[PDB]
Amino acid sequence: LSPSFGSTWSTGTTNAVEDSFFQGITPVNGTMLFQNFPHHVNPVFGGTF
Amino acid sequence: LSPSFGSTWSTGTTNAVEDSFFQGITPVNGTMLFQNFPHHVNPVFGGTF
Amino acid sequence: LSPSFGSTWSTGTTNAVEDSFFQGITPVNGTMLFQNFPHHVNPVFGGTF
Amino acid sequence: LSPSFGSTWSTGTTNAVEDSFFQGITPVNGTMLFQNFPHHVNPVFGGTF
Amino acid sequence: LSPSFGSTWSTGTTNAVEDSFFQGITPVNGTMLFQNFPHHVNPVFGGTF
């Protein structure tokens, strides 16, 4: 087994605020927990032309 | 097993504010916990032209 | 096992404010905890042209 | 096992304000805790052209 | 096990204000704690052209 991946690219802004990244061989046997609950937030997101 | 990865690239701004990165062989057997709960926040995000 | 990674590159600004990086063989058997909760914040993020 | 990594590169500014870096073989068996909670902050982030 | 790393490079400014670096074999068995909470701060960050 020999997977081939591609490069990751970006030209404009990239606002990766609050997240988690992994890469490469990552065997898991224990426990991994991901829970998310903000409870007073008023976001705004923009469109495009 | 011999995975091949690509380079990571960016030309514009990259505002990686609050996050966690991993790379390479990272076996896990214990516990990993990720929990997120901001509770008074008013974000704004921009669009494109 | 012999993974091959690529270089990490950046030309513009890179505002890595508040985060954690790992690289290389990092076996884990204990506990790792990541929790995030700012509670009075008014961010702004910019778009592109 | 013999992973091969690439160089880390930057041409423009790099404002790594408040963070933690690791590199190389870093086995962990105890506990590692990461918690973040600023509670009166008004950031601004810039876009690109 | 014989990982091979690359050089770390920078041409422009590098304002590494408030952070912690590690390199090389760093086994950990006790406890490591990282907590961050500034509570009256008004940062500004710049974009690119």
mmCIF file of C-alpha atoms in Angstrom:
data_model
loop_
_atom_site.group_PDB
_atom_site.id
_atom_site.type_symbol
_atom_site.label_atom_id
_atom_site.label_comp_id
_atom_site.label_asym_id
_atom_site.label_seq_id
_atom_site.Cartn_x
_atom_site.Cartn_y
_atom_site.Cartn_z
ATOM 1 C CA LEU A 1 0.000 0.000 0.000
ATOM 2 C CA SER A 2 1.412 3.346 -1.156
ATOM 3 C CA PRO A 3 -1.161 6.136 -1.391
ATOM 4 C CA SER A 4 -0.182 9.300 -3.236
ATOM 5 C CA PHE A 5 -1.600 12.619 -2.048
ATOM 6 C CA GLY A 6 -1.595 16.081 -3.586
ATOM 7 C CA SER A 7 -0.441 19.440 -2.329
ATOM 8 C CA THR A 8 -2.732 21.771 -0.389
ATOM 9 C CA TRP A 9 -3.037 25.223 -1.890
ATOM 10 C CA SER A 10 -4.609 28.597 -1.106
ATOM 11 C CA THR A 11 -4.406 32.027 -2.735
ATOM 12 C CA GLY A 12 -6.897 34.106 -0.754
ATOM 13 C CA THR A 13 -7.500 34.416 2.956
ATOM 14 C CA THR A 14 -7.947 31.298 5.092
ATOM 15 C CA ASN A 15 -9.441 31.937 8.527
ATOM 16 C CA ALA A 16 -9.064 28.505 10.141
ATOM 17 C CA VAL A 17 -10.300 29.663 13.523
ATOM 18 C CA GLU A 18 -10.921 26.714 15.822
ATOM 19 C CA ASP A 19 -10.192 23.223 14.545
ATOM 20 C CA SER A 20 -7.903 20.184 14.618
ATOM 21 C CA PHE A 21 -5.745 18.697 11.850
ATOM 22 C CA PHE A 22 -4.101 15.287 11.458
ATOM 23 C CA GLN A 23 -1.825 13.891 8.762
ATOM 24 C CA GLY A 24 0.098 10.673 8.216
ATOM 25 C CA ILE A 25 -0.230 7.206 9.676
ATOM 26 C CA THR A 26 -2.341 7.668 12.817
ATOM 27 C CA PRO A 27 -3.538 4.323 14.205
ATOM 28 C CA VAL A 28 -6.050 4.709 17.024
ATOM 29 C CA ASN A 29 -7.055 2.141 19.636
ATOM 30 C CA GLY A 30 -8.130 4.198 22.660
ATOM 31 C CA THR A 31 -10.859 6.815 22.699
ATOM 32 C CA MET A 32 -11.174 10.138 20.886
ATOM 33 C CA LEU A 33 -13.931 12.572 21.840
ATOM 34 C CA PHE A 34 -15.033 15.695 19.954
ATOM 35 C CA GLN A 35 -17.858 17.773 21.420
ATOM 36 C CA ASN A 36 -18.836 21.332 20.528
ATOM 37 C CA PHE A 37 -21.416 23.568 22.222
ATOM 38 C CA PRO A 38 -21.083 27.347 22.066
ATOM 39 C CA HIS A 39 -24.213 28.806 23.606
ATOM 40 C CA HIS A 40 -24.316 32.571 23.057
ATOM 41 C CA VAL A 41 -22.958 33.466 19.612
ATOM 42 C CA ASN A 42 -24.194 35.599 16.696
ATOM 43 C CA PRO A 43 -22.036 34.801 13.656
ATOM 44 C CA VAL A 44 -22.181 36.441 10.247
ATOM 45 C CA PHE A 45 -20.873 34.949 6.992
ATOM 46 C CA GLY A 46 -20.396 36.661 3.648
ATOM 47 C CA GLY A 47 -21.535 35.796 0.142
ATOM 48 C CA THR A 48 -19.833 36.362 -3.193
ATOM 49 C CA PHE A 49 -20.351 38.340 -6.387
ATOM 50 C CA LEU B 1 3.631 1.066 3.430
ATOM 51 C CA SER B 2 5.156 4.316 2.149
ATOM 52 C CA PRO B 3 2.665 7.158 1.729
ATOM 53 C CA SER B 4 3.766 10.204 -0.241
ATOM 54 C CA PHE B 5 2.415 13.613 0.759
ATOM 55 C CA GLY B 6 2.545 16.995 -0.938
ATOM 56 C CA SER B 7 3.764 20.379 0.184
ATOM 57 C CA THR B 8 1.499 22.858 1.963
ATOM 58 C CA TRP B 9 1.317 26.244 0.296
ATOM 59 C CA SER B 10 -0.178 29.690 0.887
ATOM 60 C CA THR B 11 0.150 33.033 -0.896
ATOM 61 C CA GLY B 12 -2.322 35.267 0.933
ATOM 62 C CA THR B 13 -2.991 35.768 4.611
ATOM 63 C CA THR B 14 -3.565 32.767 6.881
ATOM 64 C CA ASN B 15 -5.109 33.608 10.249
ATOM 65 C CA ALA B 16 -4.858 30.247 12.029
ATOM 66 C CA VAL B 17 -6.130 31.595 15.326
ATOM 67 C CA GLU B 18 -6.877 28.777 17.747
ATOM 68 C CA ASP B 19 -6.217 25.210 16.651
ATOM 69 C CA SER B 20 -4.013 22.120 16.914
ATOM 70 C CA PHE B 21 -1.842 20.448 14.266
ATOM 71 C CA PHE B 22 -0.283 16.981 14.069
ATOM 72 C CA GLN B 23 2.008 15.400 11.491
ATOM 73 C CA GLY B 24 3.853 12.110 11.137
ATOM 74 C CA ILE B 25 3.403 8.726 12.750
ATOM 75 C CA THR B 26 1.242 9.391 15.822
ATOM 76 C CA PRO B 27 -0.072 6.150 17.339
ATOM 77 C CA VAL B 28 -2.629 6.732 20.082
ATOM 78 C CA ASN B 29 -3.755 4.318 22.789
ATOM 79 C CA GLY B 30 -4.835 6.545 25.690
ATOM 80 C CA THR B 31 -7.491 9.230 25.549
ATOM 81 C CA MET B 32 -7.681 12.471 23.574
ATOM 82 C CA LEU B 33 -10.389 15.019 24.356
ATOM 83 C CA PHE B 34 -11.367 18.076 22.303
ATOM 84 C CA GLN B 35 -14.165 20.294 23.609
ATOM 85 C CA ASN B 36 -15.027 23.832 22.531
ATOM 86 C CA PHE B 37 -17.580 26.212 24.062
ATOM 87 C CA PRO B 38 -17.142 29.970 23.737
ATOM 88 C CA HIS B 39 -20.260 31.581 25.141
ATOM 89 C CA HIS B 40 -20.250 35.317 24.414
ATOM 90 C CA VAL B 41 -18.799 36.012 20.960
ATOM 91 C CA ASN B 42 -19.919 38.037 17.921
ATOM 92 C CA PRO B 43 -17.723 37.040 14.968
ATOM 93 C CA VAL B 44 -17.755 38.519 11.484
ATOM 94 C CA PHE B 45 -16.423 36.841 8.332
ATOM 95 C CA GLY B 46 -15.833 38.379 4.922
ATOM 96 C CA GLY B 47 -16.925 37.379 1.437
ATOM 97 C CA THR B 48 -15.141 37.742 -1.885
ATOM 98 C CA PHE B 49 -15.540 39.580 -5.177
ATOM 99 C CA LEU C 1 7.305 2.087 7.032
ATOM 100 C CA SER C 2 8.938 5.222 5.607
ATOM 101 C CA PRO C 3 6.527 8.096 4.978
ATOM 102 C CA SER C 4 7.745 11.000 2.867
ATOM 103 C CA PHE C 5 6.460 14.490 3.649
ATOM 104 C CA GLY C 6 6.710 17.770 1.771
ATOM 105 C CA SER C 7 7.992 21.180 2.731
ATOM 106 C CA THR C 8 5.754 23.808 4.321
ATOM 107 C CA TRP C 9 5.691 27.099 2.466
ATOM 108 C CA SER C 10 4.272 30.608 2.834
ATOM 109 C CA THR C 11 4.720 33.838 0.877
ATOM 110 C CA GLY C 12 2.269 36.229 2.525
ATOM 111 C CA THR C 13 1.537 36.950 6.155
ATOM 112 C CA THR C 14 0.842 34.094 8.573
ATOM 113 C CA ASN C 15 -0.749 35.157 11.856
ATOM 114 C CA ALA C 16 -0.619 31.896 13.823
ATOM 115 C CA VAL C 17 -1.924 33.456 17.013
ATOM 116 C CA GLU C 18 -2.790 30.796 19.568
ATOM 117 C CA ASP C 19 -2.199 27.159 18.686
ATOM 118 C CA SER C 20 -0.078 24.035 19.166
ATOM 119 C CA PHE C 21 2.102 22.167 16.662
ATOM 120 C CA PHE C 22 3.577 18.658 16.690
ATOM 121 C CA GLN C 23 5.878 16.881 14.253
ATOM 122 C CA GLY C 24 7.648 13.533 14.122
ATOM 123 C CA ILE C 25 7.078 10.256 15.908
ATOM 124 C CA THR C 26 4.873 11.143 18.891
ATOM 125 C CA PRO C 27 3.448 8.022 20.555
ATOM 126 C CA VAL C 28 0.850 8.819 23.206
ATOM 127 C CA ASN C 29 -0.391 6.587 26.017
ATOM 128 C CA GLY C 30 -1.473 8.997 28.766
ATOM 129 C CA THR C 31 -4.057 11.733 28.420
ATOM 130 C CA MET C 32 -4.124 14.863 26.266
ATOM 131 C CA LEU C 33 -6.784 17.515 26.846
ATOM 132 C CA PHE C 34 -7.642 20.476 24.608
ATOM 133 C CA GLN C 35 -10.409 22.829 25.728
ATOM 134 C CA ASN C 36 -11.159 26.321 24.439
ATOM 135 C CA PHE C 37 -13.682 28.843 25.781
ATOM 136 C CA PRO C 38 -13.142 32.566 25.259
ATOM 137 C CA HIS C 39 -16.248 34.327 26.502
ATOM 138 C CA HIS C 40 -16.127 38.016 25.571
ATOM 139 C CA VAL C 41 -14.590 38.483 22.118
ATOM 140 C CA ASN C 42 -15.596 40.363 18.948
ATOM 141 C CA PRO C 43 -13.366 39.149 16.103
ATOM 142 C CA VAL C 44 -13.289 40.433 12.543
ATOM 143 C CA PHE C 45 -11.937 38.552 9.518
ATOM 144 C CA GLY C 46 -11.237 39.883 6.042
ATOM 145 C CA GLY C 47 -12.284 38.717 2.595
ATOM 146 C CA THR C 48 -10.424 38.851 -0.703
ATOM 147 C CA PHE C 49 -10.709 40.512 -4.099
ATOM 148 C CA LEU D 1 10.769 3.400 10.355
ATOM 149 C CA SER D 2 12.520 6.429 8.844
ATOM 150 C CA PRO D 3 10.206 9.342 8.055
ATOM 151 C CA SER D 4 11.549 12.127 5.860
ATOM 152 C CA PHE D 5 10.351 15.680 6.478
ATOM 153 C CA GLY D 6 10.732 18.874 4.482
ATOM 154 C CA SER D 7 12.091 22.283 5.336
ATOM 155 C CA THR D 8 9.899 25.033 6.776
ATOM 156 C CA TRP D 9 9.968 28.248 4.795
ATOM 157 C CA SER D 10 8.644 31.808 4.997
ATOM 158 C CA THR D 11 9.225 34.944 2.928
ATOM 159 C CA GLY D 12 6.809 37.467 4.430
ATOM 160 C CA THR D 13 6.027 38.349 8.013
ATOM 161 C CA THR D 14 5.202 35.611 10.525
ATOM 162 C CA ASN D 15 3.576 36.846 13.729
ATOM 163 C CA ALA D 16 3.573 33.662 15.824
ATOM 164 C CA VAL D 17 2.251 35.381 18.923
ATOM 165 C CA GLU D 18 1.257 32.849 21.560
ATOM 166 C CA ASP D 19 1.761 29.165 20.830
ATOM 167 C CA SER D 20 3.780 26.004 21.475
ATOM 168 C CA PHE D 21 5.956 23.979 19.092
ATOM 169 C CA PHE D 22 7.328 20.434 19.287
ATOM 170 C CA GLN D 23 9.626 18.499 16.970
ATOM 171 C CA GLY D 24 11.301 15.102 17.004
ATOM 172 C CA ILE D 25 10.602 11.913 18.902
ATOM 173 C CA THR D 26 8.364 12.977 21.802
ATOM 174 C CA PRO D 27 6.816 9.965 23.555
ATOM 175 C CA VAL D 28 4.191 10.938 26.118
ATOM 176 C CA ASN D 29 2.829 8.853 28.986
ATOM 177 C CA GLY D 30 1.762 11.397 31.617
ATOM 178 C CA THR D 31 -0.735 14.190 31.111
ATOM 179 C CA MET D 32 -0.669 17.234 28.837
ATOM 180 C CA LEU D 33 -3.261 19.979 29.259
ATOM 181 C CA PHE D 34 -3.990 22.874 26.890
ATOM 182 C CA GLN D 35 -6.709 25.347 27.860
ATOM 183 C CA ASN D 36 -7.333 28.805 26.422
ATOM 184 C CA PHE D 37 -9.808 31.447 27.612
ATOM 185 C CA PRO D 38 -9.152 35.130 26.958
ATOM 186 C CA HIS D 39 -12.228 37.024 28.068
ATOM 187 C CA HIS D 40 -11.984 40.669 26.998
ATOM 188 C CA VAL D 41 -10.365 40.958 23.561
ATOM 189 C CA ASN D 42 -11.252 42.738 20.301
ATOM 190 C CA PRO D 43 -9.002 41.353 17.553
ATOM 191 C CA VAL D 44 -8.817 42.494 13.948
ATOM 192 C CA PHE D 45 -7.459 40.458 11.027
ATOM 193 C CA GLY D 46 -6.653 41.632 7.518
ATOM 194 C CA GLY D 47 -7.663 40.362 4.097
ATOM 195 C CA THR D 48 -5.734 40.315 0.837
ATOM 196 C CA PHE D 49 -5.905 41.849 -2.627
ATOM 197 C CA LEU E 1 14.278 4.668 13.833
ATOM 198 C CA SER E 2 16.139 7.577 12.221
ATOM 199 C CA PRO E 3 13.921 10.509 11.247
ATOM 200 C CA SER E 4 15.382 13.151 8.955
ATOM 201 C CA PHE E 5 14.268 16.759 9.382
ATOM 202 C CA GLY E 6 14.775 19.845 7.247
ATOM 203 C CA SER E 7 16.210 23.254 7.970
ATOM 204 C CA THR E 8 14.065 26.125 9.235
ATOM 205 C CA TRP E 9 14.260 29.241 7.108
ATOM 206 C CA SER E 10 13.029 32.839 7.117
ATOM 207 C CA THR E 11 13.735 35.858 4.916
ATOM 208 C CA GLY E 12 11.361 38.511 6.250
ATOM 209 C CA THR E 13 10.533 39.581 9.770
ATOM 210 C CA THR E 14 9.585 36.987 12.388
ATOM 211 C CA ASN E 15 7.930 38.414 15.498
ATOM 212 C CA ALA E 16 7.800 35.333 17.737
ATOM 213 C CA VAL E 17 6.464 37.231 20.724
ATOM 214 C CA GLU E 18 5.350 34.851 23.455
ATOM 215 C CA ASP E 19 5.769 31.125 22.909
ATOM 216 C CA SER E 20 7.688 27.947 23.743
ATOM 217 C CA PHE E 21 9.855 25.755 21.502
ATOM 218 C CA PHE E 22 11.126 22.189 21.889
ATOM 219 C CA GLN E 23 13.415 20.088 19.713
ATOM 220 C CA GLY E 24 14.996 16.652 19.941
ATOM 221 C CA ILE E 25 14.174 13.576 21.971
ATOM 222 C CA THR E 26 11.909 14.834 24.770
ATOM 223 C CA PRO E 27 10.247 11.950 26.628
ATOM 224 C CA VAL E 28 7.599 13.110 29.088
ATOM 225 C CA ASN E 29 6.125 11.199 32.021
ATOM 226 C CA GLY E 30 5.077 13.892 34.508
ATOM 227 C CA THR E 31 2.666 16.722 33.821
ATOM 228 C CA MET E 32 2.859 19.652 31.410
ATOM 229 C CA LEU E 33 0.335 22.481 31.649
ATOM 230 C CA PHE E 34 -0.268 25.279 29.134
ATOM 231 C CA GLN E 35 -2.938 27.864 29.931
ATOM 232 C CA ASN E 36 -3.440 31.267 28.320
ATOM 233 C CA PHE E 37 -5.865 34.026 29.335
ATOM 234 C CA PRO E 38 -5.095 37.655 28.524
ATOM 235 C CA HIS E 39 -8.142 39.680 29.480
ATOM 236 C CA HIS E 40 -7.777 43.263 28.247
ATOM 237 C CA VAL E 41 -6.085 43.347 24.835
ATOM 238 C CA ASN E 42 -6.859 44.994 21.478
ATOM 239 C CA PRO E 43 -4.594 43.423 18.845
ATOM 240 C CA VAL E 44 -4.307 44.389 15.195
ATOM 241 C CA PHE E 45 -2.948 42.182 12.401
ATOM 242 C CA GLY E 46 -2.042 43.168 8.859
ATOM 243 C CA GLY E 47 -3.019 41.765 5.479
ATOM 244 C CA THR E 48 -1.029 41.514 2.266
ATOM 245 C CA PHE E 49 -1.089 42.887 -1.268
#
